[PDB]
Design a protein around this ligand. Structure first.
Ligand code: ACP
Ligand code: MTP
Ligand code: CL
Ligand code: NA
Ligand code: NA
Length: 351
């Protein structure tokens, strides 16, 4: 029953995991390894997947991150989450899976719509994802959400939530803005979010304390907002120097040149390479962090899907415990590495 340390909004999705024959991917015109949104011709994929005995597990980027936070805090209601689901059986399944973990949730039911679902197709050591948002798109933040989230000072939203309406994330960020110890955190989520919601994201970033994103997402951000010279928008983020310049330029989108006691930090995950972060410190001076990622033989890497969500989960957990920026990154790395070494987007039982 609390205390709630982290509150997030997202697109609640039920993952249906199953091993399928190559004929399946070809049958639904899917490209092995790609993560996409179901096309009209792929709408029968979920019903068709049943003949492969799929396993139901809670999914969704933000949901995956708070589930990590909840697992680490242990106390029921340590993390809160809100999103929209359908009035279907799938919605009940997802809801029960979450209650089972002690997560505090309020799923808004959208009559006549289907709960978000993602087909996690395992084929040739490769994962192919096909997501159908459905009811997720109907989510509209309830007027009493701040009461539901009472006590939490860490707020989180994925750019994926902008696909329902940017107003949800803007309202959450709006609540935290101006309050020194209220921390709004955001994930770039995907390259298309950066372009599709350019202006809303620009406004949202001004109200953001911590921005998470991977190399490609930050690359698109830098290009869309002209953070680096056209001659540099092509450079590889695998290059420390370039990554640092991208992070430093991105930090400007959060600070707007001003300096307060509020947290202003940009974190870029870079696969096996060191995580890079740019932070505006107490007196306004910018500091760059570089945190090495413990080596993990490609041999032991099952799948890198969900790595980013787990990273954020660990980072936010550490942040709630008041750890330093470097310590938060290390916790995120630990969580990410656990998840990528086994089937599933959750922390192992032993972890
Ligand atoms: N090859 C690797 N070896 C060790 N750790 C890794 C790793 N790949 C990812 N990680 C861990 O996961 C974190 C995030 O990885 P990354 O930035 O690649 O996410 P991502 O969304 O790009 C995965 P994908 O490439 O499948 O889309 C890294 O900072 C690290 O903590
Ligand atoms: C607006 S599109 C969208 N929004 C939110 N989450 C998404 C989306 N697409 C896929 N996922 C989730 O990513 C999780 C793995 O990182 C998978 O578990 C999958 O559910
Ligand atoms: Cl999400
Ligand atoms: Na400052
Ligand atoms: Na995994």
């Amino acid at each position: 029953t609390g205390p709630m340390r982290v509150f997030a909004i997202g697109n609640p999705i039920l993952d249906l995991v199953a091993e399928v024959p190559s004929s399946f991917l070809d049958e639904f015109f899917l490209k092995r390894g790609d993560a996409t949104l179901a096309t009209p011709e792929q709408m029968r994929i979920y019903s068709t997947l049943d003949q492969f005995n799929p396993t139901s597990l809670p999914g969704g980027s933000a949901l995956n991150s708070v589930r990590v936070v909840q697992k680490l805090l242990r106390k029921p209601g340590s993390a809160g989450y809100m999103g929209a689901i359908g009035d279907d059986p799938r919605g009940q399944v997802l809801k029960e899976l979450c209650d089972k973990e002690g997560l505090a949730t309020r799923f808004m039911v959208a009559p006549g719509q289907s709960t978000g679902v993602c087909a996690v197709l395992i084929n040739e050591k490769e994962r192919t994802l096909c997501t159908h948002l459905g009811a997720c798109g109907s989510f509209r933040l309830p007027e009493d959400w701040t009461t539901f989230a009472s006590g939490a000072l860490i707020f989180y939203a994925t750019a994926y939530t902008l696909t329902a309406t940017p107003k949800n994330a803007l309202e959450v960020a709006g609540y935290a803005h101006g309050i020194p110890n209220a921390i709004f955190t955001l994930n770039l989520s995907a390259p298309f979010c950066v372009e599709l919601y350019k202006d809303a994201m620009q406004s949202l970033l001004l109200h953001t304390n911590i921005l998470f994103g991977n190399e490609e997402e930050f690359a698109h951000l830098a290009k869309v907002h002209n953070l680096v010279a056209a001659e540099k928008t092509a450079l590889s983020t695998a290059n420390k120097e370039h990554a640092v310049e991208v992070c430093t330029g991105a930090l400007r989108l959060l600070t707007a040149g001003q300096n307060t006691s509020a947290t202003k930090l940009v974190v870029m995950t870079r696969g096996h390479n060191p995580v890079i972060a740019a932070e505006q410190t107490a007196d306004g001076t910018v500091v760059v962090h570089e945190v090495g990622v413990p080596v993990v033989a490609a041999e032991k890497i099952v799948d890198t899907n969900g790595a980013g969500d787990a990273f954020v989960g660990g980072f936010l957990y550490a942040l709630s415990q008041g750890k330093t920026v470097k310590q938060c990154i290390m916790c995120g790395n630990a969580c990410a590495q656990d998840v990528i070494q086994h089937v599933g987007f959750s922390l192992s039982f032993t972890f």
